[PDB]
Point group: C2
Chain length 81, copies 2
Protein backbone atom coordinates (compact mmCIF):
# COMPACT_ATOMS: atom_id res chain seq x y z
CA UNK A 1 0.00 0.00 0.00
CA UNK A 2 2.97 2.34 0.44
CA UNK A 3 3.71 1.92 -3.27
CA UNK A 4 0.12 2.77 -4.20
CA UNK A 5 0.28 5.85 -1.97
CA UNK A 6 3.58 6.96 -3.50
CA UNK A 7 2.34 6.51 -7.08
CA UNK A 8 -0.84 8.46 -6.31
CA UNK A 9 1.07 11.31 -4.67
CA UNK A 10 3.63 11.51 -7.47
CA UNK A 11 1.02 11.62 -10.23
CA UNK A 12 -0.95 14.22 -8.28
CA UNK A 13 2.20 16.34 -8.01
CA UNK A 14 2.74 15.98 -11.76
CA UNK A 15 -0.80 17.17 -12.46
CA UNK A 16 -0.35 20.11 -10.09
CA UNK A 17 2.90 21.00 -11.85
CA UNK A 18 1.12 20.92 -15.21
CA UNK A 19 -1.52 23.43 -14.09
CA UNK A 20 0.89 26.16 -12.98
CA UNK A 21 2.77 26.15 -16.30
CA UNK A 22 -0.48 26.93 -18.19
CA UNK A 23 -0.18 23.87 -20.41
CA UNK A 24 -2.84 22.21 -22.51
CA UNK A 25 -2.86 18.42 -22.27
CA UNK A 26 -0.66 16.13 -20.18
CA UNK A 27 0.31 12.84 -21.81
CA UNK A 28 1.22 10.17 -19.25
CA UNK A 29 3.58 7.66 -20.90
CA UNK A 30 4.95 4.96 -18.60
CA UNK A 31 8.03 2.73 -18.59
CA UNK A 32 7.32 -0.01 -21.13
CA UNK A 33 4.54 1.52 -23.26
CA UNK A 34 6.35 1.60 -26.61
CA UNK A 35 4.58 4.44 -28.46
CA UNK A 36 5.56 3.31 -31.94
CA UNK A 37 3.50 5.39 -34.37
CA UNK A 38 5.01 8.91 -34.62
CA UNK A 39 1.61 10.61 -35.10
CA UNK A 40 0.07 9.49 -31.80
CA UNK A 41 0.01 12.94 -30.18
CA UNK A 42 -1.40 14.73 -33.22
CA UNK A 43 -4.15 12.15 -33.74
CA UNK A 44 -5.19 12.26 -30.08
CA UNK A 45 -5.09 16.07 -29.96
CA UNK A 46 -7.13 16.59 -33.12
CA UNK A 47 -10.10 14.69 -31.68
CA UNK A 48 -11.39 16.99 -28.91
CA UNK A 49 -12.34 14.77 -25.97
CA UNK A 50 -11.54 15.32 -22.32
CA UNK A 51 -9.81 12.04 -21.38
CA UNK A 52 -8.83 9.90 -24.36
CA UNK A 53 -6.46 6.95 -24.37
CA UNK A 54 -5.28 4.98 -27.41
CA UNK A 55 -5.69 1.22 -27.32
CA UNK A 56 -2.27 -0.42 -27.30
CA UNK A 57 -1.94 -3.99 -28.53
CA UNK A 58 -0.34 -6.86 -26.62
CA UNK A 59 0.43 -10.54 -27.06
CA UNK A 60 -2.74 -11.75 -25.29
CA UNK A 61 -6.16 -10.41 -24.32
CA UNK A 62 -4.63 -7.80 -21.99
CA UNK A 63 -4.99 -4.18 -23.03
CA UNK A 64 -5.51 -0.82 -21.39
CA UNK A 65 -9.27 -0.30 -21.14
CA UNK A 66 -11.98 -2.20 -19.28
CA UNK A 67 -15.63 -2.40 -20.25
CA UNK A 68 -17.38 -2.62 -16.88
CA UNK A 69 -16.84 -2.59 -13.12
CA UNK A 70 -19.16 -4.72 -11.02
CA UNK A 71 -19.50 -3.44 -7.46
CA UNK A 72 -16.06 -2.65 -6.02
CA UNK A 73 -14.17 -1.93 -9.24
CA UNK A 74 -13.02 -5.24 -10.67
CA UNK A 75 -13.10 -6.52 -14.23
CA UNK A 76 -16.42 -7.74 -15.63
CA UNK A 77 -16.18 -8.70 -19.31
CA UNK A 78 -19.08 -7.32 -21.39
CA UNK A 79 -19.62 -8.85 -24.84
CA UNK A 80 -18.62 -5.54 -26.45
CA UNK A 81 -14.96 -6.20 -25.64
CA UNK B 1 19.65 58.70 -24.73
CA UNK B 2 20.75 56.73 -21.67
CA UNK B 3 17.13 56.32 -20.49
CA UNK B 4 15.81 54.80 -23.71
CA UNK B 5 18.28 51.93 -23.40
CA UNK B 6 16.77 51.29 -20.00
CA UNK B 7 13.24 51.38 -21.42
CA UNK B 8 13.78 48.71 -24.09
CA UNK B 9 15.78 46.67 -21.58
CA UNK B 10 12.53 46.54 -19.58
CA UNK B 11 10.22 45.46 -22.41
CA UNK B 12 12.50 43.09 -24.31
CA UNK B 13 13.03 41.62 -20.84
CA UNK B 14 9.23 41.39 -20.43
CA UNK B 15 8.31 40.00 -23.85
CA UNK B 16 10.72 37.23 -22.83
CA UNK B 17 9.04 36.42 -19.52
CA UNK B 18 5.74 35.98 -21.39
CA UNK B 19 7.24 33.52 -23.87
CA UNK B 20 8.73 31.13 -21.31
CA UNK B 21 5.44 30.86 -19.43
CA UNK B 22 3.22 29.90 -22.40
CA UNK B 23 0.96 32.92 -22.03
CA UNK B 24 -1.31 34.09 -24.82
CA UNK B 25 -1.42 37.86 -25.28
CA UNK B 26 0.35 40.54 -23.27
CA UNK B 27 -1.15 43.89 -22.28
CA UNK B 28 1.36 46.74 -21.99
CA UNK B 29 -0.21 49.46 -19.86
CA UNK B 30 1.93 52.29 -18.53
CA UNK B 31 0.89 53.54 -15.12
CA UNK B 32 -0.50 56.79 -16.51
CA UNK B 33 -3.60 55.76 -18.51
CA UNK B 34 -7.10 55.39 -17.07
CA UNK B 35 -8.57 52.07 -18.22
CA UNK B 36 -12.20 53.02 -17.68
CA UNK B 37 -14.54 50.78 -19.67
CA UNK B 38 -14.30 47.45 -17.79
CA UNK B 39 -14.81 45.43 -20.99
CA UNK B 40 -11.69 46.61 -22.81
CA UNK B 41 -9.79 43.33 -22.46
CA UNK B 42 -12.56 41.09 -23.80
CA UNK B 43 -13.34 43.53 -26.61
CA UNK B 44 -9.66 43.57 -27.59
CA UNK B 45 -9.31 39.78 -27.39
CA UNK B 46 -12.40 39.08 -29.50
CA UNK B 47 -11.01 41.11 -32.42
CA UNK B 48 -8.38 38.54 -33.50
CA UNK B 49 -5.53 40.68 -34.82
CA UNK B 50 -1.79 40.47 -34.28
CA UNK B 51 -1.14 43.87 -32.67
CA UNK B 52 -4.17 45.93 -31.66
CA UNK B 53 -4.48 49.01 -29.45
CA UNK B 54 -7.49 50.92 -28.10
CA UNK B 55 -7.90 54.55 -29.12
CA UNK B 56 -7.83 56.41 -25.81
CA UNK B 57 -9.04 60.00 -25.58
CA UNK B 58 -7.48 63.21 -24.31
CA UNK B 59 -8.20 66.90 -23.90
CA UNK B 60 -6.62 67.93 -27.20
CA UNK B 61 -6.07 66.30 -30.59
CA UNK B 62 -3.13 64.25 -29.29
CA UNK B 63 -4.05 60.58 -29.09
CA UNK B 64 -1.96 57.41 -29.12
CA UNK B 65 -1.85 56.56 -32.84
CA UNK B 66 -0.21 58.39 -35.74
CA UNK B 67 -1.35 58.10 -39.33
CA UNK B 68 1.88 58.37 -41.34
CA UNK B 69 5.67 58.35 -41.13
CA UNK B 70 7.36 60.64 -43.64
CA UNK B 71 10.97 59.56 -44.15
CA UNK B 72 12.59 59.48 -40.70
CA UNK B 73 9.63 58.31 -38.63
CA UNK B 74 8.28 61.65 -37.44
CA UNK B 75 4.67 62.75 -37.30
CA UNK B 76 2.77 63.77 -40.44
CA UNK B 77 -0.92 64.65 -40.16
CA UNK B 78 -2.52 62.73 -42.99
CA UNK B 79 -5.96 64.25 -43.75
CA UNK B 80 -7.51 60.95 -42.62
CA UNK B 81 -6.80 61.77 -38.97
Amino acid sequence: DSRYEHVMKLRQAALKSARDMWADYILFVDADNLILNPDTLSLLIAENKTVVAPMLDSRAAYSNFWCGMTSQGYYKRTPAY
